[PDB]
Design a protein around this ligand. Sequence first.
Ligand SMILES: Nc1ncnc2c1ncn2[C@@H]1O[C@H](COP(=O)(O)OP(=O)(O)O)[C@@H](O)[C@H]1O
Ligand SMILES: Nc1ncnc2c1ncn2[C@@H]1O[C@H](COP(=O)(O)OP(=O)(O)O)[C@@H](O)[C@H]1O
Ligand SMILES: [Mg+2]
Ligand SMILES: [Mg+2]
Lengths: 43, 48, 70, 48, 121, 50, 160, 63
Amino acid sequence: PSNATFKNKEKPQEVRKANIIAARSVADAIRTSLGPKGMDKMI
Amino acid sequence: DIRLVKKVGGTIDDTEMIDGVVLTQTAIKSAGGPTRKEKAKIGLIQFQ
Amino acid sequence: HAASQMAKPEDVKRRSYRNYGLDLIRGKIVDEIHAGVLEPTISKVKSLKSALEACVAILRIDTMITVDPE
Amino acid sequence: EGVQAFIWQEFASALEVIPTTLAENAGLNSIKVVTELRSKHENGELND
Amino acid sequence: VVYGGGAAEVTMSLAVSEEADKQRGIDQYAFRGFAQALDTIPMTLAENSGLDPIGTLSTLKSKQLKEKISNIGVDCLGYGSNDMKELFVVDPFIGKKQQILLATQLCRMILKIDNVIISGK
Amino acid sequence: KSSGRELLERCARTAMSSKLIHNNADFFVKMCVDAVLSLDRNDLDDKLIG
Amino acid sequence: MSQLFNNSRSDTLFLGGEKISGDDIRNQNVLATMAVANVVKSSLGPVGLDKMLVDDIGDFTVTNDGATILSLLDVQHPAGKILVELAQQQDREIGDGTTSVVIIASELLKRANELVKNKIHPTTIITGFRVALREAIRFINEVLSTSVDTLGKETLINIA
Amino acid sequence: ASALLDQALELIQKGIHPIKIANGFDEAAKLAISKLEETCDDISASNDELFRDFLLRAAKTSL
Ligand SMILES: Nc1ncnc2c1ncn2[C@@H]1O[C@H](COP(=O)(O)OP(=O)(O)O)[C@@H](O)[C@H]1O
Ligand SMILES: Nc1ncnc2c1ncn2[C@@H]1O[C@H](COP(=O)(O)OP(=O)(O)O)[C@@H](O)[C@H]1O
Ligand SMILES: [Mg+2]
Ligand SMILES: [Mg+2]
């Protein structure tokens, strides 16, 4: 309702979303290197 | 306490167990010393 | 070569085929024993193994990552 | 029952990422692999 | 006409969910994804109005499964009653229908893209 | 000795695969089949289907 | 064969060069192998003919060996450096078949890449080669021939 | 539309073809609109006086 706390801040949840996508990006880079069917990565 | 010696050349099947310690270093062979000797006692020289 | 491998053990002529093949000078099939073409057995041993490990090293690569020099 | 029930539910869903990837890398149908593993585990099979 | 404001979304979400476990097949996850996708609208109204999405979503799912009356949704102005007969809110059927049709027909095109070439200006 | 109307619906169903139409093909296949049948069989034109 | 270079991605930020994945890598690795395999393909056998390489100071080197021609070809690509060092491993150990071992490896990566496009895993492909090679070495032992009834050093002459 | 895409991503990752995912939403969408049509109320039977009031109930919503 109108008496609810708005909390004044949407920047924290946006920064957490930017970190989760950045963390899932590199996690999905090495997803195909797991198990006997994994593949090598030459850097 | 485990040792792994890196070396170029050979095949994967050539890897085998060695009952004793192996030295990564090689002999000098400047004055033409022996390369093979049986029933030898190994002494560790810690000085110059 | 196939007609040699399939053959009965007891067939001299066919077995011999197992022994010969391509000639690059005259362009016909002649015997290697009389021609003198011969190699060591060690040359083929550990050659396919090196080519096998060479194939394994590139074939297992999925993605490529490059870091620029500092 | 409470607010932490959905958190524990999603914790169990995210924990099954390992066998989903093994079916993906092996070319098998993952959704099918995880629907049969639930069926076998409910019959008392601790290891499947 | 219809009665929106989270009432049509939760009504249409549980309809496909009740049919998901009847028609398991392999597309049951698509029915569940379509169900949870419809729930984002009343949760967005609950998020903007400050109400708890847990109590709001749980109340609509539990109440609408019990009672057949399908004109209860998310009260955003903070009234004491959630029944929309008294709150004077009405929406058209052609308007609420096009939200689902143009959305589900676009996303088919969005999912079918594999090659993406963008010529820099 | 089958019917002629069902022939066009049967062959047009294959064309509506690999597109956005394949689920909505039950309604739109009747449109193009009835559309082309209105044209003259001797003089079938490609500009009248704009 | 690869065209339309991969787009710089904003969701995956790694320092240095950009990351690229998919079948383009194994296509680029095979394309890098054909860059060196076509060089040594012509200088094979008696009928084969070799080429020249200048050293940018007037000097040059007319080379028949696979180890020497690849030693001067400093390959910047990573996949090509494996075959370059293999020939340096081949000529030091055995001193023979330096051209054939590179040609065998190039043909393997050709058909191996074709098999990956045929949707079988590389682990099954590698298992197929190892069981095949274990039978090949067993077959090499069958077709051996011991030198006997030879007059003098003729077996050492004709094999040279 | 973004909600369908967000839920469709999780699925793509678990492992389903994308066109098969869209086929599930089509059967779900037609069943959803069909169920909404079943529980839909019509206001055409009322006279013009009561129908005059219904325009205010919808006009106040969008405004
Ligand atoms: N006073 C209200 N009480 C309950 N629900 C409301 C009220 N006002 C708006 N809504 C709901 O919020 C939604 C807001 O839609 P609106 O934002 O006006 O359209 P658009 O999203 O195209 O701008 C409506 O669909 C309606 O169901
Ligand atoms: N006189 C010959 N007759 C038939 N085959 C030959 C002859 N000389 C060479 N070859 C073949 O050519 C191949 C490559 O020979 P060579 O070029 O000497 O070795 P490398 O491949 O190490 O350069 C060998 O496998 C051999 O079978
Ligand atoms: Mg030679
Ligand atoms: Mg509006």
